[PDB]
Design a protein around this ligand. Structure first.
Ligand SMILES: CCCCCCCCCCCCCC(=O)OC[C@H](COP(=O)(O)OCCN)OC(=O)CCCCCCCCCCCCC
Ligand SMILES: CCCCCCCCCCCCCC(=O)OC[C@H](COP(=O)(O)OCCN)OC(=O)CCCCCCCCCCCCC
Lengths: 424, 424
């Protein structure tokens, strides 16, 4: 029973090197193909009652993964790679634009989308739950989009903005979700309580980043003439900061591992010199790639589970499927809404954002596994004793987040190719 | 509860980079210090009833790891690194000596040690169980010894022999253990059945190695101008061969991942050229190092658990502790016995083995985690419905294998320094 999982990890990574050997340089990028293959395996095991004898058991184990673990195992090997592969040149001039786009943006979007669904969805949802789903659907991780913006070699400003916006969006999205979750549970909040919660959980978590950064930079300076330990040290530090933030200090872990990666991007030269700097990057690249292959295939599996696990109960009558496209058009309308509201500030701050770059920011709102963890968090709570939340409500969120994950990458991610190559 | 484990992984790897920054170039090598720190943490959590609030939960989760999983997660990242870092020059001339030392050797040792304990141990053990423990205690993995034999730069022949002997010893030790386990369960064997079991489980598993090797060498040849996928491919192939051997074809996995690593050591040049060959090694080095830091600390934790989990029941009256040194002196006497019996063959075959190298082969019988998995296998069966095996019998094996693991590394591994530096 335990080994079936090691089988699935191996099979999923082999599917990764197939879909990268093929589908490279073609018009169909990596991530969309990964997610489709994941949905394929998930459908083959769950839907087909014949089942698969060995792989199927491991697929089922990985599909029942706990969401907190789903974040803890993977994100510290994704956010760190992103925050480390960026450069100081652009970050110090784009920081104004991304922080202005990833805290106010998510507040606006959450407000809008939450209101929208509660008004036009007959499932008898309430304001807190609807704003809860808004906070869920407010994260962004356009991996395919940054991949293209480096493949076709566009301006680096757009790429830096669109990465950091995704990072600080994942962070503040988890923060707003946690707030609305405490709200749904029954905890009452006043203005001071909320302005203390957000302030601490954002800015206090940010400090842990550089605390660990300076400590581990000194300890990288003490070590002489070595590369293997220095790299394993950085890896262990990234993996320990996430736990020190999410479970020890009751603060956000994404901003912690994000402030730790850019601090390393700032002080890489003092700690690593010669070939040691070059190897540091290659190793981290693999950890990224592996972590990228497994996250997308697993994601697909999960979402397939979420459609078929209770297929008799829901995801059969077509009315739910129409509401799913309604929520989709609601998602981009709010993205458009956020960028229209924030256009003047984004204009004067940093380097000027022209209309076309604003057009790419309207696109590239691809959803990521970070919100899959949150949807699965709500469903796990709903199955257990819950107040206001009921199992069918968790049932709903799992398909709605999963559907927007599939729809955004297949449509927004694939057609991003057309806008940059021909229209621009 | 799940995150406590990610905390322990991070903490254990940080302890690794501490014990390697210190204790490097000193007379106290890496592995012994790792194992002592592991025993320290295990003792602090289990013995001290005060407990540790967070780390302790993760320590307990990792200490309750299933043995089959304990092998499957780690060994494919250890045996492959070993079988890949070796060179063709020596392997083709030492192969005769190691195969002659790791199949007949283990048969001799198992026979001797099994008989010895059954004769001089009053616990009312039977011949099958005693030979079972003999097969347990017949594995070797002297990591510290190969580390020294490369640090002080001795002849490569000794190093190659002493690595491959450890590899094929792990393999054939697991094979003999499985045979004696089927025996203990109740399955009856005749001469033909045994000569079929061993033949298939050894030589048929050996074929899977090169099947996967040639397949993955062709698929490394199709891919052009790339490094990240080629390396992730090799990793995934190593991790899938273990499962294809141990659970799909009912054969040994150690010889499979071992024939896959040397085939790559043979055909590295055709598949990887330029910097891609150099990076391939560095990445694998880390996977080795990490896997080496976690295996030893976890091992220590486990053995500490095995002494204190039932401290009231056993490991308190001194009589058991005396039998533990008796078994220790029995262990080296059989090592001496095996090499004395195999001396003439080892003489003429390959390059001549002189008396001093035979003296180092008498030493360097350090026990490894490979036999920890087997001891934990017997205990898990003993707790459940069992025939002939009873819980106290599994209770015994766990301390006896664990004690010989601690005693061999602290005594045989540390004093190996003295023999090579001054006596030779
Ligand atoms: C370099 C990597 C560093 C960190 C790696 C992980 C650190 C320790 C991992 C131990 C976690 C497993 C503990 C456990 O109980 O597993 C069960 C898990 C969750 O499923 P359950 O719902 O059954 O949870 C039971 C608890 N209520 O069932 C599962 O399906 C578990 C699957 C996930 C386990 C971890 C997989 C490792 C993947 C390696 C690649 C990571 C990216 C670099
Ligand atoms: C690059 C790595 C490739 C392969 C990595 C692993 C592949 C998939 C891992 C999933 C396995 C976890 C599944 C599970 O149920 O975990 C529980 C595990 C065993 O403990 P239990 O006795 O509770 O087992 C329950 C079943 N009866 O409880 C535990 O304590 C689990 C601890 C071990 C989990 C794996 C840790 C990963 C370590 C990464 C480093 C590996 C070396 C490179």
């Amino acid at each position: 029973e335990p080994d079936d999982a090691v089988l699935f990890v191996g099979v999923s990574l082999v599917l990764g090197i197939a879909s990268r050997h093929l589908l490279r340089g073609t018009r169909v990028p990596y991530t969309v193909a990964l997610l489709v293959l994941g949905v394929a395996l998930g459908s083959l095991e769950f839907g087909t009652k014949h089942g698969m004898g060995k792989l199927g058991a491991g697929i089922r184990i990985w599909a029942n993964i706990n969401p907190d673990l789903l974040l803890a195992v993977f994100l510290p090997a994704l956010l760190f790679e992103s925050s480390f592969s960026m450069e100081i040149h652009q970050i110090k001039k784009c920081m104004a634009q991304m922080v202005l786009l990833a805290g106010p943006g998510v507040l606006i979007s959450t407000f809008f989308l939450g209101s929208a669904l509660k008004l036009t969805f007959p499932y008898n949802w309430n304001w807190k739950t609807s704003l809860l789903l808004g906070g869920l659907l407010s994260a962004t991780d356009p991996v395919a989009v940054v991949a293209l913006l480096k493949e076709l070699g566009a301006s680096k400003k757009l790429s830096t903005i669109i990465e950091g916006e995704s990072l600080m969006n994942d962070g503040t999205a988890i923060v707003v979700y946690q707030l609305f979750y405490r709200m749904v549970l029954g905890r009452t909040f006043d203005a001071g309580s909320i302005i203390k919660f957000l302030s601490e959980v954002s800015l206090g978590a940010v400090a842990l980043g550089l605390a660990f950064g300076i400590a581990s930079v000194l300890w990288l300076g003490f070590i002489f003439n070595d590369t293997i330990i220095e790299i394993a040290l950085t890896l262990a530090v990234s993996y320990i900061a996430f736990f020190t933030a999410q479970d020890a200090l009751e603060v956000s872990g994404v901003l912690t591992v994000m402030t730790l990666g850019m601090f390393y991007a700032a002080f890489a030269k003092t700690a690593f010199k010669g070939d040691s700097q070059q190897s540091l990057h290659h190793f981290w690249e693999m950890v990224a790639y592996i972590a990228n292959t497994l996250i997308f295939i697993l994601s697909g599996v999960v979402i397939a589970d979420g459609v078929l696990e209770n297929n008799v109960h829901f995801e059969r009558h077509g009315a739910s499927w129409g509401f799913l496209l309604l929520l989709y058009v609601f998602v981009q309308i709010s993205r458009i809404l956020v960028v229209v509201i924030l256009y003047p500030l984004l204009r004067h701050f940093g380097y000027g954002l022209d209309l076309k770059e604003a057009t790419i920011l309207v696109w590239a709102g691809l959803r990521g596994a970070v919100a899959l963890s949150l949807s699965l968090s709500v469903k796990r709570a709903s199955d257990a004793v819950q107040t206001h939340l009921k199992p069918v409500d968790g049932t709903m969120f799992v398909f709605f987040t999963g559907g927007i994950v599939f729809l955004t990458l297949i449509f927004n991610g694939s057609t991003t190719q057309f806008l940059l190559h021909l229209l621009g």
